[PDB]
Each structure stands twice: as C-alpha cells, then as structure tokens.
C-alpha cells in the first residue's frame, strides 16, 4: 500500500491453518455415486460443509 | 428625505446591516453526498482503512 505511513509493513499469510500440514491423517473408506470426488485418489478436504456433496 | 416603507408603526425609513460573515450553514447546505463521503472520516486509521477509505465513490 502507497497510502499507509510507516515503514514497518505487514504482509499476512494468504491462508490459515500453518499450524496444521505437518500431521496430515489419511481417512480410507468407501463412498456411494452422489459424490463428485475421483475414486481411488487422495484428496485435500477443508472443512467439515462440503463432505456430502 | 429617505424614501419611506411601511411598518407595524406608520411609515418608517430601513436600511441595511453590514455583512458579518457568521450564520451557520442552514438546511439548504445539508446534502447526501456532502455528508456521506464526510461520514467516512469517523473511522479510525491503519493499512486496514486507508486504502477502503481512498476508494470510497459516491
């Protein structure tokens, strides 16, 4: 930004969760045709509101 | 020898004061644009509002 101050100049993360990607668990099971995810191919997941779908 | 109006008393003379200069800005001046884009300035600083309040169109 041109249009702060100071000098000192912060720069937040993109995105949360550094604390995390270092204990990654894999869950493995099965799943039924409603959902769009690839079979046999491990997935990120996010969060819980999408798990459905 | 004043030319002469008229008033609750008979037929006095007028004239005119000088102008001072004060006299509060009246309803006419009050106007949306003028004061919403002044609003804007009750909020604090920081490199969280200067950029929002630098863009702010009306």
Known sequence: ?53 | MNVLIPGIDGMVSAGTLEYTGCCPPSFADVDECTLATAFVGLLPSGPLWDRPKYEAIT
């Open chain 1, 1 to 53: 930004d041109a249009l702060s101050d100071g000098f000192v100049r912060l720069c937040i993360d993109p995105s949360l969760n550094f604390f995390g990607e270092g204990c990654k668990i894999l869950v493995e099971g099965q799943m039924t045709d409603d959902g769009s995810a690839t079979p046999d191919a491990v997935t990120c997941v996010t969060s819980e509101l999408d798990i459905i779908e």
